[PDB]
């Protein structure tokens, strides 16, 4: 059970850790988050009380290092850093614990929500989408654009999601124009799964990561990516049976977790109606269709 200590909390801020969140007042004696489950990636994130423009946060895996947060009064943000001195770090944490100046990761034992949202998400894949190789953790915020959005402007600050474009030569074999456009199976299975991602777990990992960035930061290009990766599967007539079953589970927990008051902007009516009611896989997403119908019948 690992810990991310905080040097201090000098500005009022809502702090998130995965799907949980805590309000911290200016100069309150907050010194971190303990009991963080080992085995998953995690995200710590921040929305400042005084300025709600720019949600930001850090993806990390405590197995990869000892990480802490410290407020930078010059750039105006809570920054993640790595402490290389293990004794120094254990000492700081043990003192903060002894003074009970830390919140506990509030995981219900029965609850598999975070596992289910991050099942295929791997820190090494995050670091390839978010390139900053000098750190072991990854910064994401509300405003970062994706490579695809850019093509259509600072490359060092981009989200390098895999580009999906249904009207591209990559997606359309010469001589199979109609076939490949109406049935995206060759683009899904040969180009994307066999070629770029190598396996379905990596594809699902990027899909899950895109969703979480859309949800936690309102990152619009991530929402575009999540929907494109759903649509590519649903628009393929030939999909391994294990992938369809797993997709139904992935989307179910994503729809379950999405704040009800955010469905308007984060859910794309066209993709969902096409995926659940028109596409080849309209009948392969039973759990997802049931929760969408009971929770968001308007959109549909």
């Amino acid at each position: 059970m690992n810990t991310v200590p905080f040097t201090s909390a000098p500005i009022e801020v809502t702090i998130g850790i995965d799907q949980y969140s805590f309000n911290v007042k200016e100069n309150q004696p907050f010194h971190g988050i303990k009991d963080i489950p080992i085995g998953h990636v995690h995200v710590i994130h921040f929305q400042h009380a005084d300025n709600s423009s720019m949600r930001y946060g850090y993806w990390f895996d405590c197995r990869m290092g000892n990480f802490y947060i410290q407020y930078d009064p010059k750039d105006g943000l809570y920054k993640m850093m790595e402490e290389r001195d293990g004794a120094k770090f254990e000492n700081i944490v043990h003192n903060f614990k002894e003074r009970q100046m830390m919140v506990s990761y509030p995981k219900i034992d029965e609850d598999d929500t975070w596992y289910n949202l991050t099942e295929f998400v791997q820190m090494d894949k995050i670091r390839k989408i978010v390139r900053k190789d000098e750190n072991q953790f990854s910064y994401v915020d509300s405003s970062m654009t994706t490579v695809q959005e850019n093509e259509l402007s600072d490359p060092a600050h981009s989200l390098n999601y895999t580009v999906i474009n249904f009207k591209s030569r990559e997606a359309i074999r010469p001589g199979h124009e109609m076939e490949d456009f109406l049935d995206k199976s060759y683009y899904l299975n040969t180009v994307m799964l066999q070629g770029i991602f190598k396996n379905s777990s990596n594809y699902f990992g990027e899909l899950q990561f895109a969703f979480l960035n859309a949800m936690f930061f309102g990152n619009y290009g991530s929402s575009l990516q999540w929907h494109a990766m759903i649509e590519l599967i649903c628009s393929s007539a030939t999909v391994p049976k294990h992938m369809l079953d797993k997709l139904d589970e992935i989307l179910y927990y994503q729809i379950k977790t999405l704040p009800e008051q955010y469905s308007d902007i984060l859910l794309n009516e066209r993709v969902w109606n096409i995926c659940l009611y028109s596409s080849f896989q309209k009948n392969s997403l039973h759990n997802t269709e049931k929760i969408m119908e009971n929770k968001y019948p308007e959109l549909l």
């Binding site: 009207k167 591209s168 030569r169 359309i172 124009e177 109609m178 456009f181």
Partner: protein, 237 residues
């Protein structure tokens, strides 16, 4: 973007462009079967690909054999249109290739876009104009060559005959669309107007009769009257 009444002179500038109308690609007669069900029988069709500036018409005849054992024909017909238009473009010398293709029906956009991926600098555009190109099969010589075809065939025409010797492209297009609109609205009456005077003939190498300038004015007025007469019948106004 979309072509409409606002940007209408763009059709007659010096950027090569083609209209593509797919209305008459997939043509069927609907009939009853011995058991009393309904069946279709295809007849030959055509793609109507027109340079509005020069009058050059690329009439690709679509022979019923292309549909043989094919399902979802109305969908397939859009993709076949797009395949044949892309093939036409590839067959033209580079300096003859269009810079824009305007589809008369928005459902042609995605099929044509996908077939034209090798041509990223050719813009595929819809149009808000209601154009009467479905009536192309009311031009006797075009209908005749389509029906007589026994195999796929491309036939080249100038749909303006020699009008451009005396009038501008804008005026020629306006005459063409008036004629076709009249033939679309009341074919029998329009054809009567065009052939009422036996002394005015169609040249072997033309589609329309050899009217003088003054006779064209009379014809055009008679076509406008026909369209208004028909309108007051449609709506009782």
């Amino acid at each position: 973007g979309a072509m409409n009444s606002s940007n209408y002179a763009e059709l007659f500038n010096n950027d090569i462009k083609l209209f593509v109308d797919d209305t008459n690609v997939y043509r069927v007669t609907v009939h009853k079967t011995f058991e009393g069900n309904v069946a279709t029988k295809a007849i030959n069709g055509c793609i109507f690909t027109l340079n509005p500036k020069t009058g050059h018409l690329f009439l690709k005849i679509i022979h019923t054999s292309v549909w043989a054992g094919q399902k979802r024909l109305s969908q397939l017909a859009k993709w076949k249109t797009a395949e044949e238009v892309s093939a036409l473009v590839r067959s033209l010398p580079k300096e003859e290739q269009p810079k824009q293709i305007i589809v008369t029906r928005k459902a042609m956009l995605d099929p044509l876009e996908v077939h034209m991926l090798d041509f990223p600098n050719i813009a595929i555009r819809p149009t808000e104009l209601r154009l009467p190109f479905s009536a192309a099969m009311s031009i006797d010589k075009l209908s005749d060559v389509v029906m007589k075809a026994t195999e796929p065939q491309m036939v080249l025409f100038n749909i303006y005959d020699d009008w451009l010797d005396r009038i501008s492209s804008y005026t020629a297009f306006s005459r063409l669309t008036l004629l076709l609109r009249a033939l679309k609205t009341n074919e029998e009456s329009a054809k009567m107007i065009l052939l009422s005077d036996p002394t005015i003939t169609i040249k072997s190498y033309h589609l329309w009769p050899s009217f003088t300038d003054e006779q064209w004015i009379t014809i055009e007025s008679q076509m406008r009257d026909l369209i208004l007469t028909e309108y007051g019948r449609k709506y009782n106004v």
